[PDB]
């Protein structure tokens, strides 16, 4: 779809559900530095500095963190979800963020958190546009 300008993120969380041994504090504080910068260059400008950033384990932590976060951030624009391969985490996410609690989630393979790409941060921010677009 067309680009959409006009969007920035001011608020937003990190829910990383991979590993903290495999996806650590630096790869996470890399990833959001690469993404501030390209979101920035394109004009859809993600903050540096997200409200929450937690380790999680388990479809059943997913409930409880998210309420959490509704109950805690007001102005709550986006909870990014770090994923650790294929995971019954991601249909859980999706039932809690858009059935339950209408809250947006942008989802992320751990590899493209390890290692970053221009491209594959390119697919997530263009990604992010589309669902705060209209
Ligand atoms: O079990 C799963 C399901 C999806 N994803 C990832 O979720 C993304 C899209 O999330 P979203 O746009 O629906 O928020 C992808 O890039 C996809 O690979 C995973 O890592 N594991």
């Known amino acids: 779809k067309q680009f959409h300008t006009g969007i920035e993120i001011k608020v937003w969380a990190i829910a990383c559900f991979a590993p903290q041994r495999q996806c650590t504090e630096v790869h996470l504080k ?72 209408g809250m947006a989630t942008q989802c992320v393979q751990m590899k493209n958190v390890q290692r970053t790409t221009p491209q594959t941060l390119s697919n997530l921010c263009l990604k992010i546009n589309v669902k705060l677009g209209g």
């Open 30 to 101: 890399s990833f959001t530095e690469q993404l501030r910068k390209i979101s920035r260059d394109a004009g859809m400008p993600i903050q540096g500095q997200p409200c929450f950033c937690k380790y999680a384990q388990g479809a059943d932590s997913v409930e409880p963190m998210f309420r959490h976060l509704k109950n805690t951030y007001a102005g709550l624009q986006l909870v990014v979800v770090i994923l650790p391969g294929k995971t019954p985490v991601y249909a859980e996410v999706k039932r809690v963020g858009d059935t339950v609690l």
